[PDB]
Each structure stands twice: as structure tokens, then as C-alpha cells.
Amino acid sequence: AGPSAVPLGTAGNYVILASTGVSTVPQSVITGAVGVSPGTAASLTGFSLILSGTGTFSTSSQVTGQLTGADYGTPTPSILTTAIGDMGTAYINAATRSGPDFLEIYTGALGGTTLLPGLYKWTSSVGASADFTISGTSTDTWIFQIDGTLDVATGKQITLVGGAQAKNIIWVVAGAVNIEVGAKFEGTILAKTAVTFKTGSSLNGRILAQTSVALQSATIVEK
């Protein structure tokens, strides 16, 4: 049940892919690859990067995985350019889905709700002032199309139930994404505007941002 999956292409090789930068207030705990392009590795800030012996990637205590930027040795820049293209394609693919199952549901106020599989569209902002739930099987899918901002209030969380998997959840969001202190989020975020995960928040998912990503001691686990 739910919409056909959104193709991520090689953007699905990254836990965080950005264009203008990724910052961290230490200590974030990120599992998966972190890439930026056309930003250079100088736009990866707060990571205390160690350049690899091949000059093609770097490492950080904050990342289990490789970091890459547009100024690393070949073939890294070409790989990143392709991934950025794939992110842009994924955003358009997700954003242009039609025939929503749910339109303006809850006026975008998701606290206390359970979200069944489907395509959702809001012309408003969307957020959660209380914990909420995503419920479906291991093969069901969700696409959440948000024209406004997306936010989760401090300390609040999304829980997956029923078998639902974060890899099968997409948020495609035009406005800023703000995940407050200690909140916990799930799914792949396709963002056009800045994405911020504030102190001690977490994501089981992926961040594919066309501008910047700002982390504050966040736990970001690739799904």
C-alpha cells in the first residue's frame, strides 16, 4: 500500500548530501556517507576532517563512513555532481506526484496522529507538537508533500509501527525543516531550504538538501 517508491539514484548512497554546506556542533554521531557539492570540503564544518591517503575522501570521529566534497581528488567531484543531479531529480519526482490519498489532513498538525500508507499533500506548513506514529507493513510506502515548513517540537518523536521502515518514507519539503532539541524523526528528507537538527535530535533516514544542513550533536542513522 502507498505510492510507488521515489528513485533516489546515487543520492541514495549518502546519509547526508548537501549543496552549500554541512555543519556540526560536536559530537554528532552519523552513520553513512556525507557529501557536499558544489560546496567544497571547506563547507563541511565542525568535523575535524582527516584527509585520506588517496586524497579522494576524508574521515571524522563524527561519521562512520566517508566524507566527500567537490575539491577532492578525481573521481570524487564527478561522483558528487551526479549525486546532486540525482537529488534534484528525486525532489521533482516526489513533488510532482498526483492523486493524494490525504489532502490537508489535520491541517498539518500531526501531533497525536497515526499516518497510514499513502501520498499526502499539504499546501500549509506541517509539524508536530506531540509524539505521532507511522503505521504500515515492511513494504508499504509514504510520500509527504509539504509546501510550507516542517518542524517537530522539542523532545517529540515519530515512532514506526506495524513493520513500517524508514527507507520507505519520503518527506519532500519546500520550506525550512527544523527538528528541535531532542526530537526524533524518521525517513528520507528531500529539502529545498535549510535543514536543522538541533541538540541531541535524531534521524533514522537520510537528508538530501539542496542548500545546507546544520547538525547540533545529532544522531543521524542511514536508512
Measure the CA–CA gap between 209 and 36, rounded to whole angstroms: 10
Given resolution (angstroms): 0.9
Which grid cell sits at 80?
Answer: 558528487
- CB neighbourhood size of 64 (10 A): 15
Which grid cell sits at 157?
Answer: 518523536
Burial of 53 (0-12, 13-18, 19+ CB in 10 A): exposed
Q: How was this structure determined?
A: X-ray
Evaluate whether 37 touches 53 at the Cβ level (below 8 Å).
no
Give Cα separations from 184 to 64, 154, 203, 211 (angstroms).
Answer: 20, 9, 6, 22
| Residue among 141, 153, 95 at smallest CA distance from 121 | 95
